[PDB]
Amino acid sequence: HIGNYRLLKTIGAKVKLARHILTGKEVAVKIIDKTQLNSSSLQKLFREVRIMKVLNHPNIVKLFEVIETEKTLYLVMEYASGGEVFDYLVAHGWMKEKEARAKFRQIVSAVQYCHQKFIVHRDLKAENLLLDADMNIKIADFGFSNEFTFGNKLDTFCGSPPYAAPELFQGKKYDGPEVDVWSLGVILYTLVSGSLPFDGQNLKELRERVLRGKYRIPFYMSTDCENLLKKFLILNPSKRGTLEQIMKDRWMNVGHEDDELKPYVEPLPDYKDPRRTELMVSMGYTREEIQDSLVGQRYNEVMATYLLLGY
């Protein structure tokens, strides 16, 4: 038991499935021991939380509440009951292009929206693409993410090798968004084939292959999927397609004649919904503290209840 949550079974810092007592809603709670972190780690943890609070997209795992005690930080997250795309791929082998496209339109919307908010993810990979109960994508794990500006190449060469842009294996100060564009190409490849385009016996092999930038196109892959891959997986970062360019690509829009993929528009805030507010008032909250919590984006217990009532 913690705050307004009854903690239930472990599902993954431990991650525990929990129920919000006031709303009865199911959530995933990350339990993080602060004591045993170092300054650097602590700093990155505050950054990760700040980043998660900024992102509000239907295919990004939602943060509901932050609970702090001396020794423990609790992050109350949206629960994605379908598990990782990684384990889905292992169970089903691969996705037919139509299914891959359904996932990949949601992936691309989500990441292009991160970029709109001036956030690079930096660990886009199958394990970080979760699936909710309706088989929608929910992007997770902002542990390597950072804010960026266009007047600033980035400095830190973090990622996961098979998904990492070659400039990262090199020493090379880089434009952040472009790194996520490469990783997205690798994802696309792995959704349609069920295999990774760059690997080897060891990381020195993997590295060499990534830096050559050559990958094999299986014979079943459509011409459109092949041509799309070519816009992501380009060695020179400044000629990789932009995500806005990539949204208009043919493969992305097959079956979407009337509904081309376009950048996500963040909904206006609604902090004064009469239905949710009434319910909360009869739970004993007041309108005044709902307003302060929501307008202040506090992610405290009040804000969490309001959010959970709309989910």
């Binding site: 390597f144 973090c158 090798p161 990492a164 990262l168 294996f169 020493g171 792995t190 069920g194 990774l196």
Partner: peptide
């Protein structure tokens, strides 16, 4: 190549 998990890495230049 076969789909498998790799460790995250803080500094891929090594």
């Amino acid at each position: 190549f076969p789909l498998k998990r790799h460790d995250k890495v803080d500094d891929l230049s090594k």
